Structure formats: structure tokens, C-alpha cells
Design a protein around this ligand. Structure first.
Ligand SMILES: OC[C@H]1O[C@H](O[C@H]2[C@H](O)[C@@H](O)[C@@H](O[C@H]3[C@H](O)[C@@H](O)[C@@H](O[C@H]4[C@H](O)[C@@H](O)[C@@H](O[C@H]5[C@H](O)[C@@H](O)[C@@H](O[C@H]6[C@H](O)[C@@H](O)[C@@H](O)O[C@@H]6CO)O[C@@H]5CO)O[C@@H]4CO)O[C@@H]3CO)O[C@@H]2CO)[C@H](O)[C@@H](O)[C@@H]1O
Ligand SMILES: OC[C@H]1O[C@H](O[C@H]2[C@H](O)[C@@H](O)[C@@H](O[C@H]3[C@H](O)[C@@H](O)[C@@H](O[C@H]4[C@H](O)[C@@H](O)[C@@H](O[C@H]5[C@H](O)[C@@H](O)[C@@H](O)O[C@@H]5CO)O[C@@H]4CO)O[C@@H]3CO)O[C@@H]2CO)[C@H](O)[C@@H](O)[C@@H]1O
Ligand SMILES: OC[C@H]1O[C@@H](O[C@H]2[C@H](O)[C@@H](O)[C@H](O[C@H]3[C@H](O)[C@@H](O)[C@@H](O)O[C@@H]3CO)O[C@@H]2CO)[C@H](O)[C@@H](O)[C@@H]1O
Ligand SMILES: OC[C@H]1O[C@H](O[C@H]2[C@H](O)[C@@H](O)[C@@H](O[C@H]3[C@H](O)[C@@H](O)[C@H](O)O[C@@H]3CO)O[C@@H]2CO)[C@H](O)[C@@H](O)[C@@H]1O
Ligand SMILES: OC[C@H]1O[C@H](O)[C@H](O)[C@@H](O)[C@@H]1O
Ligand SMILES: [Ca+2]
Ligand SMILES: [Ca+2]
Ligand SMILES: [Ca+2]
Length: 637
């Protein structure tokens, strides 16, 4: 490069990783020093332009040359944004004579962008254990039956006129004639999870468990809560839960663990005493009497049969959050004995909440995604963090969750359907997560990923729940048509990307399944051993991620987007390690010359494909590696 009236985009780079930002989660008194990379001698001047919410105006900070990288290929320019309590958004103006380029969350641009700027949110912090961990999601009734004595038998009880049905482990989840899909039970329970912690924390290595609903409810999924204060009898009792938590937190059976529970706060089930549609309690519920002490917990259009609910489901009456200080806000999160605080305090001390149907939470039966909804989650955050600042808050949302994350006053992160699940699905399987035809190329995949990461503050990106499948979509293995190699590829990407890798129970061995309820099949053990190639790889990949902080909180830089050979390569790096990931999405092998010079890997230095152990030497800024179809290499040093 040179001063030739031309800014070379290829040399430009900035994100909030260690090498470029000295304070990614600053307080009100910490200034933020940013470094912008360019090719050596490529520019004449650079400036930081930031919008300060304190005075609704743009501010200008000229940058100064700081240093060259170790390879002498790049320049690092530096500038500092002053400390204050206000949210700020910045972008860079880069000039080389008559050539000007702009750069922000979405990368380089010839024209000045007006969105996707980088975020500075003083005092906003997401749990570091979440950014650095690996999560494992379990749908309780389908994981492991550790205690047959609490099993729901066929006919054990009836819900809304339909008796329960017990299935033999491994059999179909579909209810037989006379029964209902939501009342089919296999016997999975908390004792079972506890007895299988060795598999989770050791065989695989995940240190975070996220469970679907576990509180008393008539269905097998239990999103129709009957009692938030009691573990459902089929899963055990509150004592069973305390034991599981102790064993998860224990460091004697593996790495320290964390537990995230599913918080179903938008609505309750129609069998909850506050509503009591079928008179299952001596108390008077809202459905039973307009004089009920809980009458105003719900919204009736025509008492008692027409009321606000979750997506028209009468079995899920919607809670009326009213105004600040309401009884409903009290029982859900404000009270010390609320649902949210009870489990965050001893003798439970869980580590977080996954917020079900979070976008709908509102007052008066309204549908959320409004001022009131965000006000509620802001109060929720204060209540939760007040009890445990390191308790995680992850909201369910299918699209861009910027509205609930980008001001640092609500959630720490969200279910990454839009920034992870969907793009990964369409790139690898050629199907969207609902198993409908939808395919994207490598260049499109890369662009999609960048644009979605740019929707969030950096700490939020690093805390997103990144799963290949989950209880509301089709299994990855079904979308892949049963091709296990596609799962191999997906796992390598998942374990080396930005955000919390999240494994939906069974995905690690290639479990198949269509739409709900077929995506909740019973866990086929004996398939859960290193003898299964996907399980062995999963274990290896988790060990790799845990070895390199760069894979969890390091910068992310695109290296190769080859649509001809279907090769995707990106680097994860920080002040200590530089890692070049090389993915082959083709059905045949490809030998790739990886431009590791972009990550500043010194010539003559050694790089190791942590997956195979095969060592390589960097020469002329390159490293040549052969990669099988639907597979990948993780070249680290
Ligand atoms: O009269 C005042 C002033 O006049 C002169 O400077 C002016 C200069 O003539 C004019 O071109 C312009 O300068 C531009 C420059 O053209 C741009 O390239 C840019 O300069 C920055 C450069 O791009 C960066 O790479 C960085 O340079 C670093 C290197 O990266 C380091 O490796 C190191 O290299 C030096 C090495 O250590 C020495 O042994 C020797 O080999 O020389 C090497 C090159 O100097 O250090 C340099 C310097 O830190 O940083 C550069 C910025 O300093 O942007 C410039 C500003 O737009 O404008 C100049 C006005 O000041 C005259 O040279 C000055 O002495 C005099 O004070
Ligand atoms: O919440 C959903 C929302 O999420 C995302 O929005 C976020 C942005 O991506 C992010 O950059 C940040 O936005 C800041 C912005 O960075 C900051 O500069 C300031 O915005 C300025 C514009 O930069 C400036 O150009 C001007 O905007 C003009 C615009 O140029 C003109 O074309 C026309 O549209 O009139 C606009 C109004 O003047 O002024 C604004 C401020 O007045 O402030 C922004 C925050 O308000 O944060 C966003 C929210 O988190 C997605 O990008 C977005 O699509 C989603 O709707
Ligand atoms: O709806 C199908 C559609 O999905 C697209 O995926 C990405 C977009 O590429 C990406 O732009 C977008 O991310 C943000 C966008 O850049 C902003 O302009 C603004 O709209 O906020 C968005 C927040 O997500 O996300 C979508 C994922 O839904 C595919 O690119 C496109 O090919 C496909 O048809
Ligand atoms: O038989 C009625 C319907 O049953 C099925 O829908 C169930 C889901 O199976 C159950 O998980 C739950 O959905 C929740 C979903 O899992 C959660 O991620 C989302 O955020 O909130 C949903 C509600 O809490 O409840 C529904 C409704 O009972 C089945 O899929 C559907 O077709 C049947 O009509
Ligand atoms: O899908 C990746 C691999 O699949 C099969 O093993 C092919 O024999 C091999 O050529 C290819 O690299
Ligand atoms: Ca130039
Ligand atoms: Ca059982
Ligand atoms: Ca009653």
C-alpha cells in the first residue's frame, strides 16, 4: 500500500476485540481507546466520529498513528472516546488523499453509513461465564428417566378431558388415538439429568445447562404453568432441584456449572389457581369469579370465556402486568418471593432465565413490542441483577432483538435464530429451519452473519444463544437429510463462532425430527458415546474452544468467501492467539491456501490444526491445508 489517493478496504479492520478496544464494557468513568488497522502507509488521516446520546450530536476525534503489527504489513491508528455515563455510537472516516472510506459494524463503505455503528454502552455488562461457556439445552421429559417412581402413566390423570399416555422409551412421540400430543410422557426427570451430568460436563464438556419448563403443569412441555413455586411431580420435587443445582455447581464432577431455567412469564396455564378454568383448587380463580383476588391478573374481553392469551391459545391466558408496582409485576419479579427472585436466591441460586414469549409481555392484554413491554424488561433486569449481577437474562425472539438489547437496560442476549440458526441452516442444508427450501452461498452466508452481528453490542454478540436446532423448529439432522458430515461442519462452525455455542440435546449425535412435537424425541442413549463420530467431534471442539479465549471473545475477521469451491474462512484472534478457521461446504475435498498474514501470523511461525494435530509452517504469509467436503480445520497458534 501507499499514499496513492486510495484507501484499501482489504487492509482496514476494527471490532471490539482485545487488539482494537481497551474497554469493551466500560463504566461511566472509563475512557475508550480504539485502534483502527490499515495497510502500512496506506492513508493520510483517520477520524473517529461518534454520536453522543447525552447531547444528541456528533463529535470528532482525530486519530494518530500508534504502531505497526509484528509482520510489518499493517498500521494501527489510535483515538480515544472520553468517559461518561452516556450511550455512544461510533464509526470511522478514513482518508488517503482524495479517497475517503467509512467503516463501522458493517465494515467498509464508500458512502457514510447511518446505521450499524459500533456501540459504547457505559455500565452495561453481560455475564462473562455466558460469553465463555458452552450450553446444553434439555427438554426434561425426553432426556433421561432417572427415577421411574415419579413417571406419569397412561391414564394417571386427565387434562381438559384427555387422559395422559406413557410411551416406551425410544418410541414415537405422537399420541395414539384417544390421546393428545401434549399429554404424552416418556419419563425424563431431574434425577435423570443429575445422573447424566458426567456425560454433559465431561463426555461433551458443556458447562451451562438450559432446561425447558420444569414447574408444575399438566402438559409434557409445561409452558402452561400451574405453579411456578413447585417443581412438577413428574420431574421430582424442589429438593430434587436443589440437589441437581448443587451437582451442576460442583467442581468435583467436572468444570463449574451454571443452570438457566425457562421463565414463562407472558402467560400462565389455564389450570393455574389464579385462573382455575377447571376448578382444580378450592380457591376462586379469575375464570371462576370476577371477585377472585386474582381477577385483574388477566384480561377478559367477555368474561369468562373470551380473554387475552398467547397466540389465541385459550390454554395460555395472558398476564396483565398493569403499571409499575402492580401485583403481577410483584409476583413475577419485584417481590423477594417472586418467581424470578425465589430461584435466584438460596437455597436455589440458579444462574439465569430464558424469557419465553418475551416480546408479548404487556399490560391490558396488548401484544407487547411497545413502550410498556420494554419498561417491564428494564425493571426485570434491575430486579434480577440486584439479586445476582451475574445471573443471565436471555430473551426468546425470532428476529433482530436489538430493541431488547442495544440500550443495555433489558436482556443480556437472545435466542439467535436470525443471526445463527437460520443462516447456518440455509448455508449447510439448503433449507430454512422449518425445513423449507432456502439456500445461500458462502458470500451470502458471510454477509448475513456480519449484518446480524452488527445488530448487537459486542458483549451481547458474545452472549447470544447459538443453537443448530431447538424445541420449536425441525432438527438439523432432518434438514440435512441425515448426512452426518453436514452436522460435522455445523459443529465446527458453531464451536468457533461469536456467541454461546448451544447444543439442543441429541444434536451432538445427529438426532433427527420434524416439527413440534417430533423435534422432542426421547434421547437415544448408546448413541451418546464417542463411538458416534459427531459426539467425539463435539467433545473435541468444546475442548478447543475452552483452550482459546480468542474463540470466545476475540475479534472476528473474514478471510475467504469462495463461492466456486464453497470455502469459508475466518479468523478469531486476540493479543495472545491467532486462529484461522477453514470450512469446506462442498461435497468434495479442497486444498486451500489460507491468508494467515491477515491475522498477522508471522512467517516461519508454526500453526496447528487443533482438530487433527497436524502442524503447519507459515511461509509467504500463507498456510496450505487440505480439507474434506463438509468439514473444517482450526489452524491455531
Ligand atoms: O513540515 C512538517 C512535517 O513535514 C513532513 O511531514 C509531512 C509529509 O511530508 C506528508 O507526506 C504528510 O505525511 C503523511 C504521510 O504521507 C502518510 O503516509 C501518513 O503518514 C503515516 C504513515 O502512513 C504511517 O505508516 C506511520 O508511519 C510510521 C511507520 O509506520 C513506521 O514504520 C516508522 O517508519 C519510519 C522509520 O521508523 C524510520 O526509520 C524511517 O524509515 O522512516 C519511516 C517512515 O517515516 O515511523 C513512521 C512515522 O511514525 O505514521 C505516519 C504519520 O506520522 O500521514 C502523514 C500525515 O498526513 O504530512 C506530513 C505533515 O506532518 C516531514 O516529514 C515532517 O518531519 C515534518 O515535521
Ligand atoms: O432497535 C431496532 C433498530 O436496530 C438497529 O438500529 C441501531 C443502529 O444500527 C445503530 O447504529 C444505532 O443507531 C444510532 C446511530 O448509530 C447514531 O448515529 C444516531 O443516528 C443518527 C444517524 O447516524 C444520522 O444519520 C441521522 O439519521 C438521519 C438519516 O441520516 C437520514 O437518512 C434520515 O433517516 O433521517 C435520520 C434522522 O436524522 O440522525 C440519527 C440520530 O438523529 O442514533 C442512532 C440511535 O437512535 O442504534 C440503533 C438502535 O439500537 C437497526 O439498524 C435498525 O434498522 C432497527 O430499527
Ligand atoms: O427474510 C429472508 C432474507 O433474510 C436475509 O437475512 C438477513 C439480512 O441479510 C440482514 O440484512 C438482516 O440484518 C439486519 C439488516 O442488515 C438491516 O438492514 C436491518 O433490517 O436489520 C436487520 C436485523 O436482522 O437480517 C436478515 C435475517 O432475517 C437474507 O440476506 C436474504 O437473502 C433473505 O431473503
Ligand atoms: O395442542 C395445542 C398446541 O400444542 C403445541 O404447541 C405448544 C408447544 O408444543 C409448547 O412448546 C408451547 O409453545 C411455547 C414454545 O415452546 C415457546 O418457545 C414459545 O416461546 O412460547 C410457546 C407458548 O408458551 O405451547 C404451545 C401451545 O400449547 C403444537 O405445536 C400446536 O400445534 C398445538 O396447537
Ligand atoms: O463430504 C466430505 C467427504 O465425503 C466423503 O467422505 C467423500 O468420499 C470425500 O471425498 C469427501 O471429502
Ligand atoms: Ca493508499
Ligand atoms: Ca421418571
Ligand atoms: Ca376453584
Amino acid at each position: 500500500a501507499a499514499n496513492d489517493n486510495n484507501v484499501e478496504w482489504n487492509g482496514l479492520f476494527h471490532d471490539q476485540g482485545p487488539l482494537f478496544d481497551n474497554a469493551p464494557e466500560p463504566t461511566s468513568t472509563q475512557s475508550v481507546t480504539l485502534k483502527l488497522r490499515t495497510f502500512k502507509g496506506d492513508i493520510t488521516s483517520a477520524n473517529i466520529k461518534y454520536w453522543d446520546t447525552a447531547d444528541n450530536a456528533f463529535h470528532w476525534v482525530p486519530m494518530v498513528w500508534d504502531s505497526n503489527d509484528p509482520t510489518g504489513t499493517f498500521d494501527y491508528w489510535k483515538g480515544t472516546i472520553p468517559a461518561s455515563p452516556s450511550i455512544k455510537y461510533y464509526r470511522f472516516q478514513i482518508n488517503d488523499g482524495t479517497s475517503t472510506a467509512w467503516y463501522n459494524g458493517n465494515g467498509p463503505s464508500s458512502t457514510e453509513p447511518n446505521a450499524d455503528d459500533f456501540y459504547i454502552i457505559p455500565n452495561f455488562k453481560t455475564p462473562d461465564w455466558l460469553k465463555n461457556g458452552v450450553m446444553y439445552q434439555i427438554f426434561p421429559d425426553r432426556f433421561y428417566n432417572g427415577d421411574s417412581s415419579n413417571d406419569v402413566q397412561t391414564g394417571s390423570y386427565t387434562y381438559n378431558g384427555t387422559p395422559t399416555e406413557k410411551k416406551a422409551w425410544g418410541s414415537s412421540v405422537y399420541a395414539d388415538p384417544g390421546y393428545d400430543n401434549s399429554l404424552v410422557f416418556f419419563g425424563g426427570d431431574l434425577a435423570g439429568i443429575d445422573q447424566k451430568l458426567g456425560y454433559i460436563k465431561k463426555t461433551l464438556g458443556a458447562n451451562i445447562l438450559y432446561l425447558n419448563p420444569i414447574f408444575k403443569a399438566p402438559t409434557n412441555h409445561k409452558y402452561d404453568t400451574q405453579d411456578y413455586m413447585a417443581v412438577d411431580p413428574a420431574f421430582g420435587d424442589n429438593s430434587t432441584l436443589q440437589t441437581l443445582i448443587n451437582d451442576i455447581h460442583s467442581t468435583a464432577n467436572g468444570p463449574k456449572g451454571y443452570l438457566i431455567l425457562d421463565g414463562v412469564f407472558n402467560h400462565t396455564g389455564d389450570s393455574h389457581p389464579w385462573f382455575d378454568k377447571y376448578n382444580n383448587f378450592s380457591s376462586q380463580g379469575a375464570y371462576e369469579s370476577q371477585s377472585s383476588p386474582w381477577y385483574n391478573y388477566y384480561t377478559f374481553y367477555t368474561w369468562p370465556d373470551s380473554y387475552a392469551s398467547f397466540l389465541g391459545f385459550n390454554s395460555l391466558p395472558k398476564l396483565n402486568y398493569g403499571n409499575s408496582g402492580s401485583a403481577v409485576r410483584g409476583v413475577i419479579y419485584n417481590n423477594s418471593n417472586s418467581v424470578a427472585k425465589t430461584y435466584l436466591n438460596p437455597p436455589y441460586s440458579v444462574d439465569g432465565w430464558r424469557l419465553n414469549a418475551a416480546q408479548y409481555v404487556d399490560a391490558n392484554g396488548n401484544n407487547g413490542s411497545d413502550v410498556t413491554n420494554h419498561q417491564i424488561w428494564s425493571e426485570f433486569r434491575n430486579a434480577v441483577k440486584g439479586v445476582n449481577s451475574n445471573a443471565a437474562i436471555i430473551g426468546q425472539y425470532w428476529g433482530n432483538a436489538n430493541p431488547w438489547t442495544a440500550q443495555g437496560n433489558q436482556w443480556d442476549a437472545a435466542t439467535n435464530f436470525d443471526g445463527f440458526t437460520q443462516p447456518v441452516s440455509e448455508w449447510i442444508t439448503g433449507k430454512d429451519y422449518q425445513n423449507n427450501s432456502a439456500s445461500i452461498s458462502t458470500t451470502q452466508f458471510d454477509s448475513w452473519l456480519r449484518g446480524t452481528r452488527a445488530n448487537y453490542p459486542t458483549n451481547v454478540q458474545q452472549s447470544m444463544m447459538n443453537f443448530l436446532s431447538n424445541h420449536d423448529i425441525t432438527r438439523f439432522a432432518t434438514r440435512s437429510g441425515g448426512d452426518l458430515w453436514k452436522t460435522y461442519l455445523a459443529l465446527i462452525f458453531q464451536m468457533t463462532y461469536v456467541g454461546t455455542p448451544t447444543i439442543y440435546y441429541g444434536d451432538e449425535y445427529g438426532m433427527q425430527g420434524g416439527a413440534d412435537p417430533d423435534n422432542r424425541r426421547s434421547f437415544d442413549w448408546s448413541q451418546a458415546t464417542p463411538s458416534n463420530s459427531a459426539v467425539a467431534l463435539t467433545q473435541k471442539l468444546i475442548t478447543i474452544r475452552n483452550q482459546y479465549p480468542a474463540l470466545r471473545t476475540g475479534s472476528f475477521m473474514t478471510l475467504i468467501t469462495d463461492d466456486t469451491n464453497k470455502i469459508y474462512s475466518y479468523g478469531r484472534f486476540d493479543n495472545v492467539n491467532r486462529i484461522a478457521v477453514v470450512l469446506n461446504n462442498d461435497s468434495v475435498s479442497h486444498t486451500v491456501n489460507v491468508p494467515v498474514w491477515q491475522l498477522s501470523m508471522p512467517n516461519g511461525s508454526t500453526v496447528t490444526d487443533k482438530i487433527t494435530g497436524h502442524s503447519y509452517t507459515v511461509q509467504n504469509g500463507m498456510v496450505t491445508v487440505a480439507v474434506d467436503g463438509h468439514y473444517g480445520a482450526v489452524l491455531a497458534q
